[PDB]
Amino acid sequence: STGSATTTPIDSLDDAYITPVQIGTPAQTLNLDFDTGSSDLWVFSSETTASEVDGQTIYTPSKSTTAKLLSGATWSISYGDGSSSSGDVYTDTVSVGGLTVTGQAVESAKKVSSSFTEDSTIDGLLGLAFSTLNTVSPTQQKTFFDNAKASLDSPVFTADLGYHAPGTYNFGFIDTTAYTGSITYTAVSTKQGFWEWTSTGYAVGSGTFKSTSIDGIADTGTTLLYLPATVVSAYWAQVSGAKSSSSVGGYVFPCSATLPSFTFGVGSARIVIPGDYIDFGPISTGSSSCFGGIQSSAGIGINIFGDVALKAAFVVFNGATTPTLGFASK
Missing domain, CATH: 2.40.70.10 (Acid Proteases)
Known part of the structure; x- marks a missing residue:
């Protein structure tokens, strides 16, 4: 299999790039920041403290017929820039650009730090570093790429980011x-x-x-x-x-x-x-x-x-x- 999705700068400076990701059944499309420096797929959700949501699109697991709470699992992350978030964990179907993973750990935020709240354009992160960095406890979870790898035509993804323009993330092919x-x-x-x-x-x-x-x-x-x-x-x-x-x-x-x-x-x-x-x-x-x-x-x-x-x-x-x-x- 392969996938291909367009990634779009969030602002006129290219401060970050967002890529649409389908989560759940029926699909809930969230715009995630694909991050090769981290290994958690986490989203703003119906569980996020209301005062910490300001314009983001949320994942509502109760509306997904394929969502399952991962019993006892929590997550908590702090990034190099000082920002942080934490919550609980569901498994659900996740698709990027036509590539589908079933049983992907989707980390639902209960709390996010102010920098996330203040950025209405980013609905969460999709980590693409190695799964050894995933923060889910007590059972560490795999990244989207790790889960998809065996099914891909080739075990690769590519980043083609644009300067002041959209670009592309491809999975499974060059x-x-x-x-x-x-x-x-x-x-x-x-x-x-x-x-x-x-x-x-x-x-x-x-x-x-x-x-x-x-x-x-x-x-x-x-x-x-x-x-x-x-x-x-x-x-x-x-x-x-x-x-x-x-x-x-x-x-x-x-x-x-x-x-x-x-x-x-x-x-x-x-x-x-x-x-x-x-x-x-x-x-x-x-x-x-x-x-x-x-x-x-x-x-x-x-x-x-x-x-x-x-x-x-x-x-x-x-x-x-x-x-x-x-x-x-x-």
């Missing part, structure tokens, strides 16, 4: 028309539960490529590109007036600047992020100071190849017995 050149595959470590890999280096604008190993994760659920402080300083040094602002929380730059591109290495291949992809707009409405899309990972503990990087590539998440990642230009 669309060879969706990229240019070849796909360069690179080794993955699953030891932390992530799609963790090692970039071979970077270049800033038209500058020389610096060969250096940068371990990080491919994370569709993180907006920005978080890299070591040395790399980030080298990038923003090429932007007149850019500086790290402790009060804002990262590098800012004059909105009048033209940003240079940033290249990262995948083996001997190179992915070029256009400068415009690094502009995240005014720090507050009407400001002439803009927030940068490349930020230091120094305070995180891990480098993160988030949407800023991934949207410049066609990315293959190869879930074979030994997983690998593939990157192509597009």
Whole structure:
């Protein structure tokens, strides 16, 4: 089997992408944030504290004839950005782009943190990291991809995120028309539960490529590109007036600047992020100071190849017995 679904930016900055997901019988369609950095499929629901729902579409398990409460199961998650959510668990039928999993764990939120409430466009998350990170207790549950893998034509999914435009998540096949050149595959470590890999280096604008190993994760659920402080300083040094602002929380730059591109290495291949992809707009409405899309990972503990990087590539998440990642230009 295969599936194919369009993913759409939630706003004019590409802060996140939402993909429609059918849950239950009859289908309840929710718009979920596909997140290769986490492993829970959780949704706003009829069980979510009413004051914490503000415009999201909810899953109502009592209206699904295929929903079954997973007795005794709870979940609770905290993401790298400080947000969190928790609740109980149903199993139900879940379909993405024509690909159907029966008995998928659907984690129903009883509580969500304020950042989720305040984002009316995201009805939940669909985790695509390794199932070892799933938070359901006392019996850990499998991700949608893990449940679908054996049925897929090939045990892969691909992320093709758009810049200021819709893109595509495909399951079970490589669309060879969706990229240019070849796909360069690179080794993955699953030891932390992530799609963790090692970039071979970077270049800033038209500058020389610096060969250096940068371990990080491919994370569709993180907006920005978080890299070591040395790399980030080298990038923003090429932007007149850019500086790290402790009060804002990262590098800012004059909105009048033209940003240079940033290249990262995948083996001997190179992915070029256009400068415009690094502009995240005014720090507050009407400001002439803009927030940068490349930020230091120094305070995180891990480098993160988030949407800023991934949207410049066609990315293959190869879930074979030994997983690998593939990157192509597009």
